Amino acid sequence: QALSEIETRHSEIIKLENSIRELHDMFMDMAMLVESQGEMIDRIEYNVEHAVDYVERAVSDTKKAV
Amino acid sequence: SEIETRHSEIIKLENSIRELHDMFMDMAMLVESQGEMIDRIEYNVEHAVDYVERAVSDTKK
Amino acid sequence: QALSEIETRHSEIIKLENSIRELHDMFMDMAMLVESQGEMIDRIEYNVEHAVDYVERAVSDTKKAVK
Amino acid sequence: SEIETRHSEIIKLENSIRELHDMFMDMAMLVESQGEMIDRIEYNVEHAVDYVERAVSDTKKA
């Protein structure tokens, strides 16, 4: 009924495993948030990139009318 | 005793895991905080884009 | 030769692109280190799991000796 | 005037960019602490695995 020494060891290691495994949900939550933030930044860079192209075209066009 | 040693090892390792779990919480909060700063930056940038595009259009181009 | 106004607006928006790219690069480095941390945790989980299966087997064999 | 508002916006943009940069410095620090805590956990887990498997074998042989 009570645990033997070998069973006690086993229980301890199983407890450690579940605990390492359960770190998953929290890590995935953080990871998702970090990944989402990266894309936000990337969209901002994308729009600025578009602004630079728009202006570069206008600058190149205007010079033509010179 | 050897038993005490093994027990302190299990408790420390346990606190460490819980602690890591908390750093992840702190990270999440830090990311949400940066998310407001990014919204502020995007607002500034969108206006900056507007400014240069208007100024470059009115100057016929 | 001094920059015209249009050229100045161009320079300004270009700087802005380089600035945002830098912010983006700093963030992506950290993001890669975080991804890497998750993989390490997976490996650890994988090793403890394999250890658990090992102990299980031994607990079974130690009990089967009882006969 | 236009200078006042214009200059004001050039400063707001630069300030918000530097502030995020600063926040990124704090993030980097937490990323480092996370990694180190994980290094430590890898060590403790390697030890616990070795310990229990050793004990498990001595019991099967005794």
The per-residue DSSP string of chain B comes to: -HHHHHHHHHHHHHHHHHHHHHHHHHHHHHHHHHHHHHHHHHHHHHHHHHHHHHHHHTTT-
Q: Do C47 and D52 touch (CB under 8 A)?
A: no
Residues 6+ apart with CB under 8 A from B32: A33
Interface contact flag, C13 B45, Cβ < 8 Å: no
Nearest beta carbon to residue D55 from set A9, A16, A20 = A9
Whole-number Å distance between alpha carbons of D52 and A4: 14
**CATH number of the structural domain spanning residue A4:** 1.20.5.110
At C59, the amino acid letter reads V
Q: How far apart are CA B24 and CA A4, in angstroms?
A: 37
Backbone angles phi, psi at B60, to 5 degrees: 30, 105
DSSP A1: -
Q: Are D13 and B48 within 8 A, CB to CB?
A: yes
Annotated resolution, angstroms: 2.4
The range of the structural domain enclosing residue D26 comes to 1-62
Closest CA to A19 of C46, B34, B18, D7: B18
Q: CA-based diameter of chain C, in Å? A: 98
Q: How many domains does chain A have?
A: 1
C-alpha D50: how far from its chain's center?
28
CA distance B54 to chain D (A): 14
CB distance from D27 to chain A under 8 Å? no
> Which of D62, D47, D60 is closest to C56 using CA atoms?
D60
